[PDB]
Amino acid sequence: PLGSMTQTFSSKTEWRVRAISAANLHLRTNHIYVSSDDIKETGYTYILPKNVLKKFICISDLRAQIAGYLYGVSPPDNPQVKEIRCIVMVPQWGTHQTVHLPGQLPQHEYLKEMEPLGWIHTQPNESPQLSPQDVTTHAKIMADNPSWDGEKTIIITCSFTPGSCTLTAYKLTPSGYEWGRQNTDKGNNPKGYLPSHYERVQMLLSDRFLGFFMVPAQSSWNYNFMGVRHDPNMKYELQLANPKEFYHEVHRPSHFLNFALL
Amino acid sequence: LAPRQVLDLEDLVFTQGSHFMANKRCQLPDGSFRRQRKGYEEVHVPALKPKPFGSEEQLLPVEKLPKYAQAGFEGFKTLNRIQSKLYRAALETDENLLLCAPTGAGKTNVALMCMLREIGKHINMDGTINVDDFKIIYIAPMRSLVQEMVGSFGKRLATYGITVAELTGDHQLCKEEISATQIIVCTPEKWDIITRKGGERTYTQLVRLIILDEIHLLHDDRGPVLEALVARAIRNIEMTQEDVRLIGLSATLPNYEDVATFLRVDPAKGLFYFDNSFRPVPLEQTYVGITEKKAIKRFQIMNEIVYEKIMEHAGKNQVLVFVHSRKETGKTARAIRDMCLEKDTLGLFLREGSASTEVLRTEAEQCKNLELKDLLPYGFAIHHAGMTRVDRTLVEDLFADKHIQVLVSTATLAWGVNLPAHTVIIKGTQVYSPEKGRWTELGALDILQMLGRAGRPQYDTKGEGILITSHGELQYYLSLLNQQLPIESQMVSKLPDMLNAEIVLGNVQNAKDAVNWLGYAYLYIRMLRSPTLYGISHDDLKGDPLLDQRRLDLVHTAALMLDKNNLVKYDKKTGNFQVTELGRIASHYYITNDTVQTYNQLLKPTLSEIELFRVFSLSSEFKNITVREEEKLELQKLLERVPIPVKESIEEPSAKINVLLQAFISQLKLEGFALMADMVYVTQSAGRLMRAIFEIVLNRGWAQLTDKTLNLCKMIDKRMWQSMCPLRQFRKLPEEVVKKIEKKNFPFERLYDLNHNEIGELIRMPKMGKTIHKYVHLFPKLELSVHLQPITRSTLKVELTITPDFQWDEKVHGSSEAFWILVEDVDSEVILHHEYFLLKAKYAQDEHLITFFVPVFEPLPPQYFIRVVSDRWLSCETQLPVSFRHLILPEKYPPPTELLDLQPLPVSALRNSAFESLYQDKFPFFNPIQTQVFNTVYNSDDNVFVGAPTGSGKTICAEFAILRMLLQSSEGRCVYITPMEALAEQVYMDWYEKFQDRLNKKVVLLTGETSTDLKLLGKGNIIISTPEKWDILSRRWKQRKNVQNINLFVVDEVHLIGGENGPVLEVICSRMRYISSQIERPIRIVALSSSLSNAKDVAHWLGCSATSTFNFHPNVRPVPLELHIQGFNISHTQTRLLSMAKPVYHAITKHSPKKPVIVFVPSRKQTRLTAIDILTTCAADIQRQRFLHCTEKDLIPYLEKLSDSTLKETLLNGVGYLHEGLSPMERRLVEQLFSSGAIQVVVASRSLCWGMNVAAHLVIIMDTQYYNGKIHAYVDYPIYDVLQMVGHANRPLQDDEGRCVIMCQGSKKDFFKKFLYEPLPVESHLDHCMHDHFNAEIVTKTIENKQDAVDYLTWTFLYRRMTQNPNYYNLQGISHRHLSDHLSELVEQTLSDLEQSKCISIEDEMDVAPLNLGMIAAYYYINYTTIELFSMSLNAKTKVRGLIEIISNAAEYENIPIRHHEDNLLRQLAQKVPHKLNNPKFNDPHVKTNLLLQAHLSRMQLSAELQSDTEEILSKAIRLIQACVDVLSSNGWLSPALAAMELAQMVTQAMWSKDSYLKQLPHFTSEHIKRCTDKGVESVFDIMEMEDEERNALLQLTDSQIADVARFCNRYPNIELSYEVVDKDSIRSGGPVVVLVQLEREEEVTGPVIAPLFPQKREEGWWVVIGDAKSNSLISIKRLTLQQKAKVKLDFVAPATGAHNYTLYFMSDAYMGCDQEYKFSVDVK
């Protein structure tokens, strides 16, 4: 060889650097911005409670997107406003462009008094436009679940702007639904996608009431390290409890059992 | 003091530790010589000659020891030479001792002599030992030594029934050991950490003797621990005056006389120094000092020296070789055995065919381990703690019988086994220290112990110790082993940590205290005697000859370090120290002060596991660890795969410590030798360090981090991560099948109710599905359920029910199992509430109830969470969500009744001159509240409610009503209820003066004796009573005219319906309402209360119209109340009390410098402690005596009357204290002095806050919890007691304001604001208390069917409240089917229990009727549970024996306290006592009262505690006795009833039936009526007939006494008894036979019974009994009181025809020897 060098490669697994950065996510919860419409209004106003937003941020990753389902109701005399009352974490795994949720929507006695309001997901980069993956996901959920009204369900993106998180809420259009339910291209400029597939909706952060989380009854929600155990057909029940952070030990047991070997 | 100067403590440190060598030179014994050799030098020191033989001393035969001590020397004839010189000083004095002697000279037996002298102090009359009286602490420096001394001393002292034990492991679960152990053997550090906490209830005040073994450890880096211990013990001897004997056992080294000074040893009495001439076997020494500095040649020079030395002994002498690793043990043993092979020299070791050569061939093939099997046939062996215990037992046994020739081992063998060898070789003196991060020299103690093992005591004429070291170490080892290495102090560096320990304890509260404390240190003594060695000039010592300045500087320096690191707050001006929680955690967890500063800086609630491992890795305990280049490749391979990422580079030692911990948890093997020693040191420390982090974050409320840190604690302890199957924690399971289970990633908890079969299948090892099933259900599991109980709209009461759902097994769980209960908020962010929870093995199957408060707010948050998490089991948790979706909040409360700005009301408004004389010179006008309610109370008959803060003159308002009653009815009757006996007494004397003295009515105070009380309400116009006393009477209202004829019923402090004894108060009020509705002649009711938020509910319940309810809130108190609630951080109660001591003083100067102050403290002990503390602070304010406002002269006609010397001292300085232990006369004097203004402060215990006849300008409430000794737990003050203490700050005629400061734990501050600034909500608890009242109402026929019971409930407050706060009562709707269902459930459950206890009958599941049992229970006011057991146990041949047994077993005596300190006292009492029990458990209250009762019948005078306990036992005994009489009677048993009736007499007069009837007479010696039996008198009647002048001449006693015996003789019953069988002729079988009895009283009832030893005044009661004595048959019985004459009628049925002779009994219930017996016959036809 150049037998005057001799270098040993030393592993530098990428999840470790990501696990260090995920431990500083809490700093972003003090600087949380909501884009104001300028589109402008579309029907309902969504009020998101800060407590679950902050927790949603703290349990996330900066590269792999995570998602929760939105549930809530209208203030008593006020049909115009949708207060988000619960975020549901279901078994999932993600990449930087999409999340993979089960086909089964949440089912629990506690949600049957509320209505489904859509979903929220983290995004690595802030983007001026709703992802086509997002439009496709939202439209295929609508096709398989009549309970999701096109005029009542939204996508909230929570984008990792530097030192911050910026929230923006979108709804599908009729034309968006029809395009996204038939769409099978995963990439970023799939044929037929266009910006008239969604509108922006007004969203407000509030401190006057608290939301709560539901999580799976047996597993946790994070399968990004146990992907093989995750399946679109998987079934899950729910419990009233708070979600564990992304790199909690229960989400990556093989890191703990294969290090102990030997 | 000033000017101080700040020192560099590090510069003063002796860096080399025990290797410090103060002596410049070393003289050797004559005959020593040096040999130059092969680049090493040898020094030889010949063996000494034993010194003989002293002027006058021979060995002492055991014969001549004291007799009690000889048992401890069984198996010896004569003490050795040293024990003989020490036996007098050790066994015949209490003198502190210092014994200096060479190793093995016999110091152990000298300690035993000291122990035996202490043991002797507690031999009682039967020869056993009062093992409750004392503890002995034996401090041994090494763990292996501790264990050997536990067995050695255990064996020697067994014949004394004494427990010797080591302190095993974790102690927040296992201080059981210590109340059971008399001789505790432990290391210095263990005893430090234990006495650093104290808290209590400790047992360290039982410590009478401390033995400091190997006290030359003072010279070690560990030496400061001994200084801390000794200084703490001695200084404590001063402040508590309890002496403790100290025994020092030392090597023979210089400065031993300074050691003696430090131990308070008198050098003329306690100091003994035996030079090396007294070694048991003389020692020939060789020191080999290598000069070769090159590692590898030096290394083989070492083995060359070893081999050459071994050969000088091969075959001749057994060789013990010492090395300092588990690993070099084998490597050296093999290196030696191998180069003998190379040079063919193994034949010298073994005998070509010995008895031994096969004894080790035999045992080697059967020995089972690799290293040993290889060497043992060659005469070689190894020994270390990394191998077996029976292989080590093998090695020790084979060596013992002279079978092994060469044994390589380490220091542990030297310390832990008694194993001498003729020849000892110490191969090298260098050892790896993880603490210092490098190689160092062995400590002195180790070297001494090893070479001590040379020379076997019986076999050898001399021993030969060979020490191989580096040549520059020769002088050091020569000095250590030839009496010349001086013992120095190592404590300047440890000074900050040990000073903080004293501050945390409260022993040191300022820089002066610390200068005093430092004066007790060994450091101080050495500074005085060798200043230069300690950094002090001789010029400076001498301008400062006590080193006063120097100590202040040191203390100054240390305090500044503690303050900079936030352990202490240090005021340089005053020198005061303030404790903190950080400080307390550092002391209690044994953490250095730089570490807890790092923890304070870095810990944040958002911390990740990544950052948590980093924080741990930065602990200063690891500050000497480095990353070596030879470690970096193995560290980086592990850093690559660590499950917890590590931010920092591997070049930082932080990263290496981090990786070592994770590697430990994952149980990795590592190849570097240093790295594994570092791992061991990092992780042994991790345990207490991580438990410190946990306590820090738990008490800060940081939910997420609390979870992480508690889990890391468990991962460290259990050596596994969460992700592993929790069943690995069952170590008795093949780590096989667990890996099986982990392979299948399926959740652990659906193994639970799955069966034995499907377990084996899912795992694919059905081979053992039942075993996995077994362990699955051993795993600890709790089920949680909750009853939510809204208090207000912002406070929620939670009752948590814990149900164990697992099978217990002491093999796995032990005696208990600990948990943390954690109430967390919506976001699992904040711990709203937490407590420790201990599941005891005896309760492993019961439900446990927990109650606590949490705040709530609006709009209601979605849920809280309750987690119950194991303190030790990993993956062992239950989280119960607590959703509020259905929480029904009570309505917010109404506004108060306005206080109207009315013209103040003159006393003239009473328009009655006699009435005005009750008030007119106390004040001119009534306050605003009395002005507003006057018209309604005085000019109306409406039921009225008045709610206002304590101190608003509410009871005057009820006086208004009494006065209106007297106008309407000249002989009208008032019943006044107050909930507290002390309040009833206060009101009694004030109302006695007002209405009897100044108005000529009758004011009476109900006693609780039934017909005494009944006479009182027949005559009194004002009847004052507590609730129970009125309940017993008011139950009988249908038969008792003088109950329904009540004009006025006043209940005071009625808000106490909501407190612990509220239900009886609710019931009797509910009854007065029900009665008034029946009789239709309304009974007026007035209710007085503290401010209530739900006042309208009370008022509606009591029939008060809206205009006649004055619901005032606290802001209207006539004397404005300035209320201050100060929160305190510290969670540990002792330390928190300390943190409050100074603020108590400052509160006085800030809020009431001149005006009177009451300090309420949690306990009797604390009253004294705080009075002295207040004073000590006053003296350092140089304001001594400024609370004394009378002369130091007017004080002392008051003072000399007192018994307590401390109360006199503090009173002399202006400060009294009050507690229930002081004579009633002591309390009155303190109160007079306080109310006269003579003394300005009185410190009162909390239990006195109802019976206090004094008021103050400022009330300080110093903490708000008290220790309940039954439940071994701290209990919050009831809000009612707090309101009552706050009310003592109210001087209407003296102050413009009242002030109160409440100091409480910070977690309680919000609660006190919510419930003191606002009016109080109250609930009923009658629904938990129904049985005894339902039973009474069925007896009285108020309740006759289930519907009646439902209606009855509608009269109660419980029932009004059920619709206002439904959830509190477990109702979910207020609908009328809702509460009519709920009412019926309460009814069905109550009646079913009563019917099953046979108190009532139920017919048609509808109609209820009383049974005799129930009638008895109701009549005597006895728990139906008690009467049920009374019905099981009493039989036809019950005697005085069982009557006392059965009676003690009543539920009324369940709460008689067990005091740990009375255990042997009750044991010895059960031997002083006539009737012996059956296998008595002395932890049982019913056994306890059984003996208190026998003590009382025997007139044994006991402690003040046991006599107050006796007095409450006695307050209940008559009714239980009379109940028994009633049961036995209704069952027809004659002899046991007659016995029960004499029991009544026995208890009343305190005697036995066998006793002399003259024992009842006043002033009667029990000496002289065997002098009275000597001259013809046996009864009382004989004394009265007896001439007068001779009467004064019998008794040998005084004349005032002669009038006392006269008054007794003149009330002693003398009754004439007639009886006639009416129509005695025409009596036919099965017919009525009526016997007529006449009782005429000679005398009067000239007053009540005379019985000075019985606590209540009694009236004479009587039984008339018709029995068949031959048959044991009671046929007729009647109870009667007697005046002059009474006639009694007894009926029964005639039996078959006879010939039937009966016996008539007339029995007293109060006096002995008054009983009469007349036989009579009836001829029946």
PDB file of C-alpha atoms in Angstrom, chain B residues 708-835:
ATOM      1  CA  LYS B 708     -34.822  10.178  34.716  1.00  0.00           C
ATOM      2  CA  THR B 709     -32.705  10.424  37.863  1.00  0.00           C
ATOM      3  CA  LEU B 710     -34.691   7.887  39.881  1.00  0.00           C
ATOM      4  CA  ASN B 711     -34.355   5.535  36.936  1.00  0.00           C
ATOM      5  CA  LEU B 712     -30.613   6.086  36.687  1.00  0.00           C
ATOM      6  CA  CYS B 713     -30.306   5.290  40.403  1.00  0.00           C
ATOM      7  CA  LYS B 714     -32.010   1.967  39.728  1.00  0.00           C
ATOM      8  CA  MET B 715     -30.048   1.232  36.557  1.00  0.00           C
ATOM      9  CA  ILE B 716     -26.853   1.738  38.534  1.00  0.00           C
ATOM     10  CA  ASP B 717     -28.052  -0.453  41.406  1.00  0.00           C
ATOM     11  CA  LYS B 718     -29.473  -3.241  39.204  1.00  0.00           C
ATOM     12  CA  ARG B 719     -26.866  -3.186  36.380  1.00  0.00           C
ATOM     13  CA  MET B 720     -29.315  -3.074  33.447  1.00  0.00           C
ATOM     14  CA  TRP B 721     -31.131  -0.586  31.281  1.00  0.00           C
ATOM     15  CA  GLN B 722     -34.918  -0.099  31.160  1.00  0.00           C
ATOM     16  CA  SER B 723     -35.079  -1.776  27.763  1.00  0.00           C
ATOM     17  CA  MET B 724     -34.169  -5.093  29.384  1.00  0.00           C
ATOM     18  CA  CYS B 725     -36.846  -7.479  30.545  1.00  0.00           C
ATOM     19  CA  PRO B 726     -37.578  -6.471  34.166  1.00  0.00           C
ATOM     20  CA  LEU B 727     -37.523 -10.136  35.182  1.00  0.00           C
ATOM     21  CA  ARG B 728     -33.698 -10.055  35.124  1.00  0.00           C
ATOM     22  CA  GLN B 729     -34.102  -8.442  38.544  1.00  0.00           C
ATOM     23  CA  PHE B 730     -35.009 -11.893  39.747  1.00  0.00           C
ATOM     24  CA  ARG B 731     -31.381 -13.000  39.894  1.00  0.00           C
ATOM     25  CA  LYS B 732     -32.565 -16.598  40.434  1.00  0.00           C
ATOM     26  CA  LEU B 733     -33.534 -16.976  36.798  1.00  0.00           C
ATOM     27  CA  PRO B 734     -31.353 -18.096  33.900  1.00  0.00           C
ATOM     28  CA  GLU B 735     -30.312 -14.846  32.172  1.00  0.00           C
ATOM     29  CA  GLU B 736     -31.060 -17.231  29.357  1.00  0.00           C
ATOM     30  CA  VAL B 737     -34.834 -17.162  29.304  1.00  0.00           C
ATOM     31  CA  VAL B 738     -34.877 -13.411  29.830  1.00  0.00           C
ATOM     32  CA  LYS B 739     -32.834 -12.906  26.653  1.00  0.00           C
ATOM     33  CA  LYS B 740     -35.341 -15.268  25.040  1.00  0.00           C
ATOM     34  CA  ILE B 741     -38.101 -12.878  26.075  1.00  0.00           C
ATOM     35  CA  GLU B 742     -36.237  -9.715  25.066  1.00  0.00           C
ATOM     36  CA  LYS B 743     -35.616 -11.225  21.612  1.00  0.00           C
ATOM     37  CA  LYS B 744     -39.401 -11.127  21.156  1.00  0.00           C
ATOM     38  CA  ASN B 745     -40.106  -7.391  21.308  1.00  0.00           C
ATOM     39  CA  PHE B 746     -43.494  -7.774  22.969  1.00  0.00           C
ATOM     40  CA  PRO B 747     -44.744  -5.622  25.874  1.00  0.00           C
ATOM     41  CA  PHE B 748     -44.021  -7.039  29.318  1.00  0.00           C
ATOM     42  CA  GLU B 749     -47.434  -6.544  30.887  1.00  0.00           C
ATOM     43  CA  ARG B 750     -49.557  -8.750  28.639  1.00  0.00           C
ATOM     44  CA  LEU B 751     -47.732 -11.622  30.251  1.00  0.00           C
ATOM     45  CA  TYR B 752     -49.793 -10.853  33.351  1.00  0.00           C
ATOM     46  CA  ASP B 753     -53.242 -12.398  33.067  1.00  0.00           C
ATOM     47  CA  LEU B 754     -52.091 -14.708  30.296  1.00  0.00           C
ATOM     48  CA  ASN B 755     -51.764 -18.260  31.648  1.00  0.00           C
ATOM     49  CA  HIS B 756     -48.936 -20.711  32.403  1.00  0.00           C
ATOM     50  CA  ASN B 757     -49.398 -22.482  29.057  1.00  0.00           C
ATOM     51  CA  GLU B 758     -49.351 -19.551  26.617  1.00  0.00           C
ATOM     52  CA  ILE B 759     -46.256 -18.146  28.337  1.00  0.00           C
ATOM     53  CA  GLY B 760     -44.281 -21.253  27.449  1.00  0.00           C
ATOM     54  CA  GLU B 761     -45.576 -21.081  23.881  1.00  0.00           C
ATOM     55  CA  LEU B 762     -44.998 -17.365  23.165  1.00  0.00           C
ATOM     56  CA  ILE B 763     -41.407 -17.772  24.372  1.00  0.00           C
ATOM     57  CA  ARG B 764     -41.138 -21.226  22.785  1.00  0.00           C
ATOM     58  CA  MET B 765     -39.913 -22.749  26.007  1.00  0.00           C
ATOM     59  CA  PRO B 766     -42.990 -24.471  27.465  1.00  0.00           C
ATOM     60  CA  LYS B 767     -40.352 -26.377  29.432  1.00  0.00           C
ATOM     61  CA  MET B 768     -40.875 -23.642  32.050  1.00  0.00           C
ATOM     62  CA  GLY B 769     -44.056 -21.661  31.568  1.00  0.00           C
ATOM     63  CA  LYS B 770     -45.127 -22.077  35.159  1.00  0.00           C
ATOM     64  CA  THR B 771     -41.847 -20.598  36.418  1.00  0.00           C
ATOM     65  CA  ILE B 772     -42.014 -17.488  34.222  1.00  0.00           C
ATOM     66  CA  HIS B 773     -45.645 -17.281  35.358  1.00  0.00           C
ATOM     67  CA  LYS B 774     -44.476 -17.447  38.976  1.00  0.00           C
ATOM     68  CA  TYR B 775     -41.951 -14.625  38.680  1.00  0.00           C
ATOM     69  CA  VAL B 776     -44.400 -12.553  36.606  1.00  0.00           C
ATOM     70  CA  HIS B 777     -46.666 -12.421  39.647  1.00  0.00           C
ATOM     71  CA  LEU B 778     -43.867 -11.926  42.146  1.00  0.00           C
ATOM     72  CA  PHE B 779     -43.077  -8.713  40.297  1.00  0.00           C
ATOM     73  CA  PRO B 780     -44.461  -5.821  42.377  1.00  0.00           C
ATOM     74  CA  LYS B 781     -47.638  -4.303  40.965  1.00  0.00           C
ATOM     75  CA  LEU B 782     -50.088  -1.810  42.473  1.00  0.00           C
ATOM     76  CA  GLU B 783     -53.593  -0.918  41.314  1.00  0.00           C
ATOM     77  CA  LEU B 784     -54.728   2.665  41.874  1.00  0.00           C
ATOM     78  CA  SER B 785     -58.196   4.107  42.246  1.00  0.00           C
ATOM     79  CA  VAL B 786     -59.214   7.563  43.303  1.00  0.00           C
ATOM     80  CA  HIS B 787     -62.071   9.376  45.009  1.00  0.00           C
ATOM     81  CA  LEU B 788     -61.957  13.073  44.035  1.00  0.00           C
ATOM     82  CA  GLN B 789     -63.211  15.384  46.811  1.00  0.00           C
ATOM     83  CA  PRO B 790     -63.582  19.050  45.824  1.00  0.00           C
ATOM     84  CA  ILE B 791     -62.924  21.320  48.779  1.00  0.00           C
ATOM     85  CA  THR B 792     -63.447  24.624  46.978  1.00  0.00           C
ATOM     86  CA  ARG B 793     -63.277  25.649  43.331  1.00  0.00           C
ATOM     87  CA  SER B 794     -59.487  25.874  43.633  1.00  0.00           C
ATOM     88  CA  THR B 795     -58.559  23.135  46.129  1.00  0.00           C
ATOM     89  CA  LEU B 796     -59.123  19.436  45.537  1.00  0.00           C
ATOM     90  CA  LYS B 797     -58.872  16.732  48.192  1.00  0.00           C
ATOM     91  CA  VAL B 798     -57.790  13.401  46.726  1.00  0.00           C
ATOM     92  CA  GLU B 799     -58.201  10.051  48.445  1.00  0.00           C
ATOM     93  CA  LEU B 800     -55.924   7.552  46.691  1.00  0.00           C
ATOM     94  CA  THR B 801     -56.543   3.835  47.252  1.00  0.00           C
ATOM     95  CA  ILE B 802     -53.528   1.573  46.695  1.00  0.00           C
ATOM     96  CA  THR B 803     -54.312  -2.107  46.124  1.00  0.00           C
ATOM     97  CA  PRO B 804     -51.325  -4.487  45.921  1.00  0.00           C
ATOM     98  CA  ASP B 805     -51.760  -6.747  42.895  1.00  0.00           C
ATOM     99  CA  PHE B 806     -48.862  -9.137  43.357  1.00  0.00           C
ATOM    100  CA  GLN B 807     -47.835 -12.063  45.507  1.00  0.00           C
ATOM    101  CA  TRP B 808     -45.388 -11.336  48.319  1.00  0.00           C
ATOM    102  CA  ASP B 809     -42.325 -13.422  49.171  1.00  0.00           C
ATOM    103  CA  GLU B 810     -39.846 -12.310  51.872  1.00  0.00           C
ATOM    104  CA  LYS B 811     -37.182 -14.203  49.919  1.00  0.00           C
ATOM    105  CA  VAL B 812     -37.546 -11.539  47.198  1.00  0.00           C
ATOM    106  CA  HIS B 813     -39.341  -8.556  48.720  1.00  0.00           C
ATOM    107  CA  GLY B 814     -37.975  -8.600  52.229  1.00  0.00           C
ATOM    108  CA  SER B 815     -40.010  -7.080  55.033  1.00  0.00           C
ATOM    109  CA  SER B 816     -41.093  -4.011  53.049  1.00  0.00           C
ATOM    110  CA  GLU B 817     -41.234  -2.383  49.627  1.00  0.00           C
ATOM    111  CA  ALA B 818     -40.949   1.359  49.000  1.00  0.00           C
ATOM    112  CA  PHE B 819     -42.647   3.583  46.446  1.00  0.00           C
ATOM    113  CA  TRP B 820     -42.908   7.231  45.482  1.00  0.00           C
ATOM    114  CA  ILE B 821     -46.360   8.705  44.966  1.00  0.00           C
ATOM    115  CA  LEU B 822     -46.110  11.512  42.408  1.00  0.00           C
ATOM    116  CA  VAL B 823     -49.019  13.770  41.480  1.00  0.00           C
ATOM    117  CA  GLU B 824     -48.043  15.486  38.230  1.00  0.00           C
ATOM    118  CA  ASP B 825     -49.818  18.208  36.246  1.00  0.00           C
ATOM    119  CA  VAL B 826     -51.360  18.237  32.748  1.00  0.00           C
ATOM    120  CA  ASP B 827     -47.995  18.253  30.978  1.00  0.00           C
ATOM    121  CA  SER B 828     -46.108  15.821  33.278  1.00  0.00           C
ATOM    122  CA  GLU B 829     -43.957  18.870  33.950  1.00  0.00           C
ATOM    123  CA  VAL B 830     -44.514  19.818  37.620  1.00  0.00           C
ATOM    124  CA  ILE B 831     -44.871  17.525  40.632  1.00  0.00           C
ATOM    125  CA  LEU B 832     -47.818  19.060  42.466  1.00  0.00           C
ATOM    126  CA  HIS B 833     -47.439  16.667  45.374  1.00  0.00           C
ATOM    127  CA  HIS B 834     -45.265  13.731  46.347  1.00  0.00           C
ATOM    128  CA  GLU B 835     -44.765  11.446  49.312  1.00  0.00           C
TER     129      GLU B 835
END
